[PDB]
């Protein structure tokens, strides 16, 4: 039995820096969800998601959910820096009753929801240089109203268009107005997208409406960190190997507890 037929049942906080999501998913903390304020600028070598995690903000979705989840996991850092964009002619800091922060109507802490200014929301030409030597990760969104009335009162534009572009890439999104089942008393949605701006490349935003603007970038280096889903508690112990069923000593050359591992782990074999 060089295979450890049963695991510890708990995950050791050592040596790998373990960050428990608890009531938060990585994406909710990435966007900044009211209950996820305590995850800002917080690093991790391994980030454990829980089955009990929800979202308590303004409903959204991500088309390529698996790419963005693996980006933030590989970097191991939620450190963003706020950059001052030039949002002349628009109303900033849009709030909603479905995203309650500090017992008040708020929004995602890292997203700026843009509405019209005096019923005029111009075409926006915005440039961001990225003078650094490391890949920036921008998180932006597109709001899908429920009616043509809602589209008009929010952006003063029946057909909004958004075109996030760099010297290398070019993304265009079109809103989708329509009646949608209420989510926490909200029939509207938001579509989340991401854009990597490489060093020396320029970020260009051309928008006419329905834009959930980003407030900053994130630092990505595709490091050693990763992400795992588990329900085993986090205990006070030291163990090189970590599995969704708990920590595991790495003294035996094989293992069958789970095919997902992290760190100095024995090679997996089946039952």
């Amino acid at each position, epitope marked *: 039995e060089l295979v450890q037929n049963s695991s510890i049942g708990e995950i050791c906080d050592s040596p790998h820096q373990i960050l428990d999501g608890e009531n938060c998913t990585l994406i909710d903390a990435l966007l900044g969800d009211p209950q996820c304020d305590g995850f800002q600028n917080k690093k991790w070598d391994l980030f454990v998601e829980r089955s009990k*995690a929800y979202s308590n903000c303004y409903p959204y979705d991500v088309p390529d959910y698996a790419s963005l989840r693996s980006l933030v996991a590989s970097s191991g850092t939620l450190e963003f820096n706020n950059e001052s964009f030039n949002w002349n002619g628009v109303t900033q800091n849009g709030t909603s009753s479905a995203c309650i922060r500090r017992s008040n109507n708020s929004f995602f802490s890292r997203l700026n929801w843009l509405t019209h200014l005096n019923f005029k929301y111009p075409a926006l030409n915005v440039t961001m240089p990225n003078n650094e030597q490391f890949d920036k990760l921008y998180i932006w969104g597109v709001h899908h109203p429920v009616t043509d009335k809602d589209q008009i009162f929010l952006y003063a534009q029946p057909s909004g268009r958004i075109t996030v572009s760099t010297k290398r890439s070019q993304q265009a999104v079109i809103p989708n107005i329509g009646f*949608r089942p*209420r989510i926490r008393n909200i029939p509207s*949605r938001i579509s989340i997208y991401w854009t990597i701006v490489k060093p020396g490349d320029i970020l260009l935003i051309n928008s006419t409406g329905n834009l959930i603007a980003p407030r900053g970038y994130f630092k990505i280096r595709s490091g050693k960190s990763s992400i795992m889903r588990s329900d085993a508690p986090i205990g006070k112990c030291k163990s090189e190997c970590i599995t969704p069923n708990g920590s595991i000593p790495n003294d035996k050359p094989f293992q069958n507890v789970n095919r997902i591992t992290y760190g100095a782990c024995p090679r997996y074999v089946k039952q």
Partner: antibody
Amino acid sequence: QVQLQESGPGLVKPSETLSLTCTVSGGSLSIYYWSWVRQSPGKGLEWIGYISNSGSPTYHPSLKSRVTISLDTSKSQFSLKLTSVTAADTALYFCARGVLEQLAPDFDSYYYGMNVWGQGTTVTVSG
Amino acid sequence: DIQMTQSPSSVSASLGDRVTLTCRASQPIRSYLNWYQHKPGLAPKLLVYAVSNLQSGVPSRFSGSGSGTDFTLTVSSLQPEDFATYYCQQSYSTPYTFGQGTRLEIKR
């Protein structure tokens, strides 16, 4: 507002092909899907199949090849057809507006809600 | 291929009481389930999207919960105008199997 109106025969002789027609009122299409369900006398609701605005249908595997649903945005109408009908097909058929979404908290699979419904068209299959 | 089961089948509960209807699943669904309100001769109306997520025109006295295979609806104070017959769907797989239905009796 939004309302639905099924239209079709009230009686179909056995082995024939049912053909009902639902109607769009005053609502946008786009991401909506369009399903029908047949209510039995008391057996319980049974789902039939649903088409996207693009025109890609999926049946209910209980009806092996018996269902063919269609769509035509020119008249804002879409029909469902049941071939080789037998006495087991007596039911009360509805048409409903389904909305396909991916909720934020869990991305694991798709959600589906029948936001809008119609009153029903009683259909009997007897000789 | 994939069914569910809603308990009870038909139960009477007086005016002002508090009734709970439970939908049992074959496999864990997380929150891929829905609830509807079906009245005599009328089109069924949505009550619950996902779980505990209410629709327009639904009072706060309705409230559901549950995860995995077990989900419940709870009418805090039963009112006569509600009544109806209540179902659950399995919005997770392709058959989209619907619940058998639970009759609500006013009993007042």
